[model samples]
Target: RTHLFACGIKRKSIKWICRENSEKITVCVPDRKIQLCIANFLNSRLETMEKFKEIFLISVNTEAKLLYNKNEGKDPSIFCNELRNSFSDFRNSFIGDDMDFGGNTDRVKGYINKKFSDYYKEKNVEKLNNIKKEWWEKNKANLWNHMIVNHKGNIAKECAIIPAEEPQINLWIKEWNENFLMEKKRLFLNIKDKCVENKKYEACFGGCRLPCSSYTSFMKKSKTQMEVLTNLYKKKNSGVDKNNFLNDLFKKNNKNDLDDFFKNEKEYDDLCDCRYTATIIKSFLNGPAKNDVDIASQINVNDLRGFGCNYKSNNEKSWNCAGTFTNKFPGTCEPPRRQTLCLGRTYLLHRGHEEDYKEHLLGASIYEAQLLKYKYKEKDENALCSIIQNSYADLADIIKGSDIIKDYYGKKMEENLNKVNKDKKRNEESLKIFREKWWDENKENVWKVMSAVLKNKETCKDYDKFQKIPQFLRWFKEWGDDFCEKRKEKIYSFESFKVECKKKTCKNKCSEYKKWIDLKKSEYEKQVDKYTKDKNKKMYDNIDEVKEANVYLKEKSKECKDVNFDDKIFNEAPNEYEDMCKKCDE
Candidate 1:
């Protein structure tokens, strides 16, 4: 109920809804423990009864402020987010994982978009209209004259006369400019719609945004586009005679003409809209054909050329390839198992084999390489890497910086460093726990020695107390002789008898224990030094962020010593400030 209030739902509406649903399932929670009980009951109720999902969705959003955004002083974002989460939960409880959404056509983003449209209508466009009023007052005369007598050049021009006052024309010009400017604000920084077929996507209206790109979006389009390109390439290939393709491109008798060699693929026409097709041709002539497999190892285009999978020393390696391309599944990925075999089954999936492969992985994945031939065709891994490595590269310059974006970059760096710190701590604790738990069985010998040592120290008698060494040696002449005579042995020298006493001195803890403990300490401290050194290195990296996050932690900690306490808005305290406060910490 409090959550619903947070979402901007009225208290009276909540009361009436809760009252009506009391018979179905009373959610009256007056205590923490009871609240959990009610929650479990509600979950079970939702699982068993499908009817609960609708009432629950509706009774929550039944009276929601349709397009409430943060522009209002305070709004129900928390409540709406909460409701959305519950809707997801309700869906997952049943009819999930089978591609069902209650037959609703207005998808999640669609509903959200509609509300945003409403906001623009009620709030944003109203501002647009006000701004338009003054601009209209200034330009109305020209607009009125144009509408009256101009063919835009003649029929649309004025006659130095009273042929004006075309109200419709004035309003049309004002509204056209107004609406176009509004649209430009949405998806573009400025408009082009007039640049040229290819360059028109550039939008040279000199807006703040990085230039808009149609090709960038086009790059992510359907696989059918690639198929179309390949079909065209195949048709072009059929028309060309390969007999002369390299005759001009290459020298016949090891001749030297570096200019012509580097000038081109020697007149090879490349047209696939990207250099990727040309790059595919270049790969063969330059790298792998020269016996340098290492240069070509990372590429899959070579795979389409038939050597994609092969051992350098084939028969010697005992590799057995016996799978048919048409076989649904051949289990022989490896040769006959005599406990040692390196033979592997290899398949080349390329447009060359597209006739054979009925379907392929989408161009969004690692397997995309096996499905096509193009530069960066490993779903363009190289291109994406190149983009980041040179974000301020020739074509894609970094956007201009401002205070908000500057801090955003810093905040991301800080957040990443903080994550590293937390992960480091988690690693330390987990490794220590594993080491301790593992030592439990391995330390058995040491424990046994310790127990034996204690037993010997307490109960082992001192035979030398009377008849051995100095005290016993004195008695050796008298009592030692008597002791020896009664034992039926010659008056045993005290030194010789001393050996017997030492031998029976309980457990002789082997020298291995001392060596083992020292080594264990050595192993333990060695890593401890590393963690400390690495942690210090990381501290510099985390310092700025650590300071920022630490201040937030301190501030939040200052407000609530036990931050589990909730704010008064929710009433009472919480078990963890893990929701909003956690975001602050992050």
Candidate 2:
């Protein structure tokens, strides 16, 4: 009853309706614990129900205001009587013959009469008119506009998937945007028709079964929407792993019998859609995607994708939605499994298969290459020796800084001086002159030799000179273990690197590659068009069957929009979202 009040149903209406329906299943809250539990449960369910009630009342009330304006110069009391009769009609359709307004009905009738008389007291109808005008003026905008939000809004909710992850996610969005809202409004109006048929003016909208049936009908339509949603997640060859994951999650989180409930494919698909739908509805309601921050928030996308891989891997699982079943029946998705497999399934459904594989594993290869580069500067002693041996080439560049390697090289100079029995000052002076002279003489050859080394060949004319210097020195830079470790800490962690590469490189590259595929597809489609055109000409010479054979090829362009890819703008560079996900080199 309090929940109904919160939904804007009047208190007296609630009391009258509840009194009329006392025969129905009534819970006896014996203690505070049970009361509180029921309150919490109802509180959660009442949010969406409350939105429905508010929207329904606003529409009905707005209709009354519109009617008032239409019946100009009519007696205010007569209009009020007309409004009361309309409410009576609405009430009658929902409550049916079970109404018991026998004794107290006149008492309520007098109460309503006095209320209307009070409104008209001392020619204050004008003031009352102002009150009505002020009300709609302040609250008219979002009353209907809320229904026409983003085209993806319903898709996101029904699919139980993030919009950014799904390409063909918008496949049915046109139908939904075009038809679903009309159906919803029509469904709400059906409640009034049902109320008029049942004949009980005292019954509030919340206390009646008609509105409940209307909502059920709405859910039925939503279930059909889920066919496309669940179809995207279904695997033809890869069902076992997904089913096993689903089964594991189902058993681990709940006591329901999955084998019995999910034996039929239709029921299984329904079950999966139910699980996924809840997640996306919550996501939509939660405001991030609505805020448009989802584009910048790559972490959440990766999080969903990671969960999807977990479903496929079946080796790892998440428990985020552990206990939140979709419903009380045999098919509620366990909370963890819902987040893991269901949410993940939505994500995986959006990606191309090969692209999914590349995005899933590209980070490892990038990380490996970076590790090798870093290690060459740190633990590889031979590389270190080679760099020092060729230090004469870059002494001023790499070793001019008074540091560890410099000290080591200076120490080597002293040992060589002792072997040659040369004066320390003179030997140091000779070393500097020799280094300059050698570089000046061989600078051109040095680049050629280094280029040869880079290409894995020793074809340089000054191959001997290049060989005299250590192989590592030609590619060496001033990097050290500290820089290597810092880079590792910042970017080279396996998981972090993988995610980084995906956002920075792989996503843009994969999308470009998709465009390339789309281009070839369109080209092939054009060939089919030309072939059909040619076949039409040949039909005059040969037969109609030859032309009929080309019909399938010509029809290929009908499904072109089915692939949700942009063929025009190929983003070869990473998008602005890349700044939020920095690369390994950065």
Candidate 3:
């Protein structure tokens, strides 16, 4: 049975007892008994020291047991003192001199560990957690520095050992789990109805117990496929020595070699053979896009099991078609637009006959025009317009040259656009001239067409009946600008088509610029109405004053006439002598 209190054994008194016993041992027979007690004492010390070594994460060397032999033929008192001094030195060195070899020896804790355990189990849980946190706050920096220096913080054993104390480990687990939970949150939240947007590599391997340790093993063991990433990083960044390169893909906030390596669908599908890679990709395919037939169509089923997923050999081939592997844009054909159609829209168009090809090219030209209209100006616009016109005619000439016509047009247009863009100032000036010429030639005609449509007598009278002169004037004001814009759209389309075909002539009388002539006409009727009361005869109402007001009104009304240049002229009763006179009628 053990005492509940301290062992009450002083090191000096224990040493004296051992020395006293050693003096009584004279012969070899008595030496055996003294040695037995010495052995027991040494065993107790080793056991007690072992616990402290565990707390400190240091390995115990049993080679010290050779001390018994080294002291073999010596005086028993000398032998006992030698062993005593050795343990005393180690005790003072390993932890300071504050050691309690207390009763219930196995339950004894090191000084720091005792305080930690006591605080960890405090009745006030908040205080317990605070102490644990405070302790880690003080020690964690040095602990991590040592871990990174010794193990590069990549080995599980070393990583755990440095922070193995209960408080430290608890904090480690807490942070580790928090990172893991966030990864899961991102994985689920980023997953949409049928595909993931902005996929992350963490969605793949974040579940491992020691992710770095597992990845180290993966980097070591993956012999064939690892070179893809290794060479990519080496080639792209001129090797890691010159620049900081991320070695661990799953490291938080690191978008480095492995992440980019996985983006190449061919390499990811055929080259990468890691189990986590397979697991991540498989989960993506089955979880997100399993039911999406459109996305499923892009998958090459023959390569599925190539990612190391289990499969029935008797059944279909492996697939590597998930967005995880390919990362294709979901609903459009963009970069490799020829192949990445959402529902094979262009693929079918590509395979169709000449009409299909023509229709496709025409639509593509229109699309290009729409986008190019905003990108270039001045002489560049003319160059672009010429380029577009020439390309359209070339494609039309080779309508039989279907299937590859789009390819030819895209390449040619891009080459021309690039050439045009080489002189940015010249291109800008050219497009500005085109815009200015179009605006000057048509600005008045635009207002004229608008007035003919908006200012007819019946239309004005209809508006007046509704007491809507303000509303009528507002509509009349806006119609001219809208008409101007309508002509501008045609000017853009016709320029892109006619510049090369017509040699930049405005002469194609009915199709391009000529077609911009709008002749919708209205009739203008001048009716002067007299405004007077029978009994009112004032000097202000005299004919000369009336004519002076009429002159002012007529000049202002000429702005409305210039706006109606194509209208039919109608003359009604010209004038009346009244107190007041309306401008249009009397």
Candidate 4:
């Protein structure tokens, strides 16, 4: 450091030489007095070096502020490539794409995605989520679920296999177990003693051992179980759980499985006792509600198989709601939608509040049967499209159910039949009148258009400009149906026509006309050949490919079909059609 410092100030003038490299610029003095030479030299060169340091310092400071201003966006939470790209670009423009810096500052200088990285080390997930959310303020839409759903928490919600249990239900089952069967057995035996002396009914379950009051309670739990199972069954069928019914559809249904299915079913049937229970449990002296203990607060409302009656379960009791039962939603007491279209509505229609039928017809909500029932009456906005395409069936139900619920669906079918017949008769009459009044020949109009598109004036126009061709075969080959398809619309896309003609089997020309052109071209070639290649080899001048190409135009006569030209085409062309198109006027 001291040597560099010593070398800098005192070189030939004992000054800055090895300490810096400034290109060692030579300075000129206006005057050259031999004695003042060294003095004048030091004065100008030293001032130049001093000026260089001052400007360099200001430029460095200006760039320091620009670096802060160049930053655009936040560092994203989970690996953003964009923030780094913009930051790298900003640093490069200043620190020199051309200038040599020590390291790749372009790669090093950017906001870091360590926002979540530090939080992840502590494993504070809630704060990690907040940090992730706050960091990616603009990148919310493309969020990865990994940033939100915890690995440990997801197992309990989606993929857990074990079923849940109920503690209150457990104790209730325990108490029912101790008291229920004993009372049931006592009642059965007591009645058996009084009735036909306990004879086993010859083979059938009959007399002497009548069913007890505990009979309904015996299998009442199964009803609730099936109802719960049924809810899962409906959900499985609803396509929400794709895996739920997969085994049912694809699992092996071999002979053993089939036999077992029926065998278990038969065993289930065997368990049923056909005879009605005549025995009853003794009534308490207290009021009905008071007598029952450990009672259920709400009705089970699970299945429809049980008869109307009270049942004893650990001294608690419940009724059928029974002969008392009417229309009700299957799962709950309250209507899931509007009551007017519910089972209650069906009852009202039956009970002569027939006016409620409209609301039902419209639907319990906007949707009937499923949805949008009234607004799109018979309109199933949720149903597949083809159902509504028929148009009549969609409106038929709504039309029929009005004025009289008695008419219900019957009137609409009959009315539709009349509508169809009447419309058919009117259409047939209109058709006869249409045929009598008009039969225009628009085929000729189409023919005119064919000429313009095909350039029909010059037979050789397609065939190096020379033959007459047929029209019908041309139209058939070119655009059989699409040609007249939009005659009424009157808009022909020229580019579309060109494509149809060449690539899409549009008219290259009718087969008959094309054949005629080919035949004429061939004959002209033979004429040219016979005239030129006589026994006199002197007249055989144009008898090669040149003569064939010029006279016959390759048998198809499509000489000009793929014509392209440079400006020299005008500079050098046969003077007239007779000279060029007509095979040199041979």
Candidate 5:
């Protein structure tokens, strides 16, 4: 019968082995505590093994379940048959042990070769040839040089060439001049029609309304005369007029006879006729300066370019004086300056002072001549000056009587100056308050707070002591609120508040706190220094022991060359053995 102990190892033999292995030759006792500990460790190990077996079985069962589910919807017989016959065709086509049957191999090779051949053919003929042709065509124009000519030849070859006789040349020149004039006339007529169409004449003629009743009546008669004159002029110039053609035409026209002749003419002619010119003069007379003679002097009947009158001129030559006199003032006397209101006003004001000086002079001269001849029986200079001066006094009095203008401009200026001064004062006071408060606080963070406030234009309008009192007070209040809120959240005590405030306000407190913090930091550093020194010394001693153990392990390894074991086993060990060997080696 075998004498079995409670554990698997023989107790006395294990004790002897352990005692022999110990370097100090210590006696190995049967330790109940160690035995109990080993029993617990073995029980835990068995539990871990059971858990691992459970996990492995579970995994295997799950794999089997998945396989079964996968095969559930499939036909089992068909599946089996497919599996059995999958490689049967390959087997039948196999040459010896290899499965190279050459099925479709020639077809595949032929297709691949044909594809490559087609690609190369396309590349050379289609792509490359097309590209070469395109390049040549693009540069062909640049490579060639050519010139094209167009000539206007002599017209005499198509017609008869007259000799250079003076009469023939004169006739030719006259014909050419007539043609040129006709062309210029056509162009001018077209421009006139265009101006009429666009209502351009309205700028000079007060839209479509005619002038005064008397002028309008005269223009109606004058336009009729003009039409007759125009036809006569054309006939005479074109060499079509015979004997007394104009006189004969005028004789046929009675009071209303000319109306029938011009009725067929354009409506634009109706607008451009004498009526339009008179209307423009009427309008100018009624305008700012109220000078009829001035308007008459500015008229431009001969301008022939659609009312091209200069508003500033006063002379008849400058205005449409020639046409106005011929058409409207024919056989009528010119008015004197003192008798006519417009000329009187113009004469009172010197030519230099007159806005339309030339127009005033022309109008005044005509008025003086006509009035002296017709209206003014009293020819005294005193009476004329008195009347003209009274007219000017009335105009000046009108300007002076307007209170609205005076009140509006005067009040606006006063208000603007007041606002500017008030704003300046406000800004000055704000800056002063800000600087004074900053000094009063005397905080260590005063500069930082002030810098933040200064950056805000609304809070600090001026960097100097020129800011408003209200603005500085508002900023100080906001700073105080923010500072209090932060202090309360960090340390909720009045003592902390007092300390914080003191640190910021008092220079001594700020310096003292800084010194205290520095001192404590230095003391803590000293303690860390001592601790690190001791720890490092222990670490270095352990390193030296390890080095001595490593040397011993190396010598022991050399002595074990006689053992029949792997060289790797002697050189490298498991982690635990390596760790122990490292200490020995060291």
Candidate 6:
């Protein structure tokens, strides 16, 4: 038991104790004796430690592990110390000596040196320096300097700093020249081949059929012809020498200057032609005084003189001669008038009698005059007048009661007007009915529809549904009933009683009320039955208690009655007998 307590076991809690039969000594063993036994406990603890060590080793070695042969008989402490020292030396080589055994520097250096030695070795400075020297010497100027050295002057010598012997320089120059020549040949060949492929090998002056020389010659000849024509015109107007002007104009290499000089001359010549034509027409028409026939006849003499035309006399025949002469001039000639000549008796008879003839002649002359007016002005006003005149002929026929056309049109117009009036009246009546029906059925729903439309204008279908009369009426009636109910419930304290009254009034027309009343009565009866059962149970329990009390009292009374306090029997008994009887009865 003491052992059990020492092992943290309660004394009575022990399930068993062994006894030494000869010595009569007892020994306690706990119910869990196998685990509590000393040897087994030590062995279990060792196994647990072994498991922990195995798990720890698995976790540590999962990264990287350094192992040494323990079979060399070295103490584990020595091995551990040696391993720590080795890591420390490695850490100090990179970091410093100011570190302890468990410092991170040692472990980090150990990990890196063990896992990635090749990476650091490659970055070593001596190897890098040797590589740099080897590369630089092979790539330096001494081996590559093979240009020519021209020793003509200091500048020339400096320019050819890669001094080589003449033959060697020539060889290098030859190589460079060959390369440059090859590049030039390549560029030329490529360009030539490209030109041939594109069919552009021949020089193309805009791909013209004529050669440059022929085109230049054609242009020169055209220019010469234009110069000669220009000079001829200038000479004709200005009376200048044609041969000299042609020579000068043709000699001009600058064609624009020559064209400009001739352009002004051409304009002057055109003005001279216009002015000379105007002068001739004016002299012929107005140079003579109106009353002087002799002067009028001599007016053509003035026209002829102005244009350097010579005539024999100042008579009408001489005037005709001057007119013909003026008309024959190339650049300044008046137009000839069109003529219609008489054809004797037949033509005169077609012209009609004296007044009729005069009238017919006037009409013909007026028609011809109107035709001339249209031909000269090309205005539509004359055509409009002609249309009006033709339309007037039709109006004249109507005015003479030709088929009563006005009456026919008037009757048709009246029929159309009546039909229009009837249609308008019907439309007005329909519109009025529509307005009335809309107000009667859709007033509230229209407002709701309008509100919905404003709120969700993007979706007109939603608003359209809100405007439906049947749906609106249903919702309105429901909402109104609910709203009134809520208001009565909240604002009227007697709402329930009022509702009961209304229900009773409404129930007069309904069989549901009778059914409801019957159900309520049935429920009341059930409740009353439940109450009666509870009351009967309480009353029965009270009666039972009363009966039990009465029985107990009766028994007490009987006992009292059965006890004999008579002196005879009491005296015959001794004191002890009396005490015995008293004790027995009590």
Ranking by TM-score: 3, 5, 2, 1, 4, 6
Which candidate ranks first by TM-score, i.e. highest?
A: 3
Q: Put down candidate 4 lDDT per residue, 302-406, tens digits, no spaces.
A: 110111112122231211111111222111111111112211122212322222232222221111221212222332332212111112122232232211111
For candidate 3, write residues 78-178 as lDDT tens digits.
33333333332233222322111322221332433344445354545346446645654564454334323432322343223333332211222233233
List the candidates' TM-scores in order: 0.14, 0.15, 0.18, 0.12, 0.16, 0.10
Between candidates 4 and 5, the lDDT winner: 5
lDDT of 6 by residue, 1-586 (tens): 3222222321222122222323342222112221121221212222343442332223222111221332134334333332222222222233322212222324433443332234334555455445434532443232222111111121233333432322211122223223333333443343333333322212121122123223334334434433444433454447554345434543452334445522323322222221212322233234432223233223232323322323322221100112232232211111111111010111212322232222222222222222233232333443323222222222222222221222343233222223323235545355345333433343332222112211122323322332222211222222222223332332243344346655763223223323433433333233334334434555434322222311222232222233332233113222333343233322
Model 2 stretches with alpha carbons more than 4 Å out: 1-106, 109-306, 310-586
Structural RMSD, model 2:
35.9
Q: Compared with the true structure, what per-residue lDDT tens digits does model 5 show for residues 1-586?
A: 0111212231111110112222332222111111210111212222343442333233222322222333355544322222112122111111112111122322322332343335444433345435434533453232111000010021123211211222211222223223333333454454354346534443133233222222334345445434534443444357454454444554554323446533424544444433333333223345422333333223233332232222222332211112233242221111112112222231212212211222322332323222222322243443232222222222111112211111232233222223323234545345335433433343212212112211121332222222211221222222222222332332233356445655773234334433533443333233234334534555434322222312322333332223222223222322323343244322
Candidate 3 ranges beyond 4 A from true positions: 1-163, 166-173, 176-193, 196-475, 481-586
Once superposed on the true structure, which residue ranges of model 1 sit more than 4 Å away at CA? 1-185, 192-586
Candidate 5: misplaced stretches above 4 Å?
1-164, 172-176, 197-200, 203-586
After best superposition, candidate 6 residue 295: deviation in angstroms? 99
Whole-model Cα lDDT of every candidate shown, in order: 0.26, 0.31, 0.29, 0.25, 0.29, 0.28
Q: In terms of lDDT, which candidate is strongest?
A: 2
Candidate 6 stretches with Cα past 4 Å from truth are 1-510, 537-586
lDDT of 2 by residue, 1-586 (tens): 3433322321111000112235452221111111111112223322343443464354335434433543456434333433333333223211221122333233333332344335544335445445434543444344323222322232223322211211221222222332344455565465545444332321122333345345555555454443333333243224333444334533653434333422323422222222222223223334332233222122233333333332223342421111322122111111211122121222222222222222212221112212222334343433433332232233222211211222333333223323333235555556545444433454443233122111122222443353333211221112122222322343334345467756975445435444543443443343334445544655334322233312332232222212223332223322432343345244
RMSD of each: 36.4, 35.9, 28.6, 42.9, 58.2, 63.4
On residues 191-235, what C-alpha lDDT tens digit does candidate 1 reach at each position? 223222222112212231122332223222312232332233234
Please tell me which model should have the higher lDDT, number 3 or number 4: 3
- Weakest 10 consecutive residues of candidate 6 by summed lDDT: 335-344
Model 4, residue 352: distance off in Å is 37
